[PDB]
Design an enzyme around this catalytic site. Structure first.
Site, PDB file in Angstrom:
ATOM      1  N   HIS A 109      55.713  41.372  17.069  1.00 27.91           N
ATOM      2  CA  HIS A 109      55.158  40.962  15.786  1.00 27.91           C
ATOM      3  C   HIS A 109      53.755  41.520  15.639  1.00 27.91           C
ATOM      4  O   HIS A 109      53.117  41.948  16.606  1.00 27.91           O
ATOM      5  CB  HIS A 109      55.211  39.428  15.597  1.00 27.91           C
TER       6      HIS A 109
ATOM      7  N   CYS B 143      47.059  38.673  17.383  1.00 25.67           N
ATOM      8  CA  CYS B 143      47.672  38.005  18.519  1.00 25.67           C
ATOM      9  C   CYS B 143      47.314  38.704  19.819  1.00 25.67           C
ATOM     10  O   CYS B 143      47.133  39.924  19.852  1.00 25.67           O
ATOM     11  CB  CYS B 143      49.189  37.982  18.343  1.00 25.67           C
TER      12      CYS B 143
ATOM     13  N   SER C  99      49.972  29.961  12.377  1.00 22.40           N
ATOM     14  CA  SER C  99      49.070  30.927  13.003  1.00 22.40           C
ATOM     15  C   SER C  99      48.483  31.894  11.994  1.00 22.40           C
ATOM     16  O   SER C  99      47.364  32.379  12.185  1.00 22.40           O
ATOM     17  CB  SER C  99      49.773  31.724  14.103  1.00 22.40           C
TER      18      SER C  99
ATOM     19  N   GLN D 125      57.291  28.786  16.606  1.00 18.86           N
ATOM     20  CA  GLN D 125      57.093  28.064  15.360  1.00 18.86           C
ATOM     21  C   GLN D 125      58.292  28.297  14.465  1.00 18.86           C
ATOM     22  O   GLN D 125      58.772  29.426  14.355  1.00 18.86           O
ATOM     23  CB  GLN D 125      55.810  28.531  14.687  1.00 18.86           C
TER      24      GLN D 125
ATOM     25  N   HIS E 270      52.937  36.962   9.585  1.00 16.30           N
ATOM     26  CA  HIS E 270      53.572  37.813  10.578  1.00 16.30           C
ATOM     27  C   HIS E 270      54.405  38.899   9.930  1.00 16.30           C
ATOM     28  O   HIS E 270      55.030  38.671   8.896  1.00 16.30           O
ATOM     29  CB  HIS E 270      54.519  37.028  11.489  1.00 16.30           C
TER      30      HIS E 270
END
Ligand SMILES: Cc1occc1C(=O)O
Ligand SMILES: Cc1occc1C(=O)O
Length: 147
Positions: free
Chosen positions: A43, A97, A138, A115, A141
């Protein structure tokens, strides 16, 4: 009719039908092709000021807005789809990330570990397929299912 999550739609600018997946936010002109214990995904994450932790290896304080983060995500998707850039390259350079250091690779995972919106998109992607923008706590993505 169509694989999990896919529906028909109409282009506003062109009038040609296309296919949209409401789990992955993928969209494409071609009719979609078509669940395992585990999938493997990479990702690219773009965080924003309402991210659960607005900090990353790129930026101690992430201050961009959600709308600005989505604009970045959309631009990355465009360059990946045109071939101008590779997913792995953009992930290594721009993913908020820690997985950026592994070209975005998260390895393999089961249902229940990630998630939910990420898990759902990952498992609705076919091997080799890429998501559209996927929202979690977060950030936003781009998901690439590799296995
Ligand atoms: C920034 C954003 O978050 C959720 C939806 C949108 C949009 O602009 O469509
Ligand atoms: C500038 C650009 O690059 C790829 C798509 C677009 C757009 O305007 O929609």
């Amino acid at each position: 009719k169509l694989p999990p999550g896919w529906e028909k739609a109409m282009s506003r600018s062109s009038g040609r039908v296309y296919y949209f997946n409401h789990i992955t936010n993928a969209s494409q002109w071609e009719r979609p092709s078509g669940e395992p214990a585990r999938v493997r995904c990479s990702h690219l994450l773009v965080k924003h000021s309402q991210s659960r932790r607005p900090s990353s290896w790129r930026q101690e304080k992430i201050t961009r807005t959600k709308e600005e983060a989505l604009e970045l995500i959309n631009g990355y998707i465009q360059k990946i789809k045109s071939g101008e850039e590779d997913f792995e390259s953009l992930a290594s350079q721009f993913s908020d990330c820690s997985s950026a250091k592994a070209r975005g690779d998260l390895g393999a995972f089961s249902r229940g570990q990630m998630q939910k919106p990420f898990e759902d998109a990952s498992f609705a992607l076919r091997t080799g397929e890429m998501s559209g923008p996927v929202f979690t706590d977060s950030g936003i993505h781009i998901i690439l299912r590799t296995e």
